[PDB]
Amino acid sequence: MAYDGLFTKKMVESLQFLTTGRVHKINQPDNDTILMVVRQNRQNHQLLLSIHPNFSRLQLTTKPPMFARVFRKHLEGGIIESIKQIGNDRRIEIDIKSKDEIGDTIYRTVILEIMGKHSNLILVDENRKIIEGFKHLTPRTVMPGFNYEAPPTQHKINPYDITGAEVLKYIDFNAGNIAKQLLNQFEGFSPLITNEIVSRRQFMTSSTLPEAFDEVMAETKLPPTPIFHNHETGKEDFYFIKLNQFNDDTVTYDSLNDLLDRFYDA
DSSP: OOSOHHHHHHHHHHHGGGTTOEEEEEEEEETTEEEEEEEETTEEEEEEEEOOTTTOEEEEEOOOOHHHHHHHHHHTTOEEEEEEESTTSSEEEEEEEEEOTTSOEEEEEEEEEOOGGGOEEEEEETTOBEEEESSOBOOOOBSTTSBOOOOOOOOOBOGGGOOHHHHGGGOOTTSOOHHHHHHHHBTTOOHHHHHHHHTTSSSOSTTHHHHHHHHHHHHHTSOOOOEEOOTTTOOOOEESSOOTTOOSOOEEOSSHHHHHHHHTOO
16 A cells, blocks of 8 residues: 555656657566566666555566467557556556557557556557456456446545645544545545654644645655665555654665665565
């Protein structure tokens, strides 16, 4: 769950330099992972897309089965027209334009949904007909016949579409695990960020909550601080800003990709 919406917003920002690049290679080093090399001005870049139930994520990194095959068929060759996030959700869509077998142009979208054990990687056409799924849902259906439909959802709100003054409407201060309430109403939030906001004033009240919220959402728009963090716990975490919850120890990095490269070595 530390791969948030907001973390996603920031990983997507750093992947825009790949727009225009050509999909040059696609491997699958295990059942949970797609490695997609994008060649932009004659240099290669390794895009890792993991669907792993714990480690689901999207990053560039540093160091053939059916699904990879299907992917090469439709994508190998193509140009990346767009990489974008759906709302503030934990969903990235890469838009590729390519050729089929007999040269006619085809329009494809790769959809990564990062939801712990409900993580999936999915290929659809320009009309959202699912071409293939790294995982199938039979019992929403996620099979090659069908139209892709977004995840369940609780009709949450996009924290970017709302002001702090406006958040109040959705908070009962008397209730009140303010972080838990913020997690329940806002798309792409996590414990990390909810706890952080609640931490940005001494007390959570109708005057302060708005201030905290705005303050934090403003910081999300700044270029991030890729940061690794407890010697008491043994625990490890990562994020894209420094969180008053992060004392004690912490290493920061050049990029989120570096940050991740390290963190998932163990």
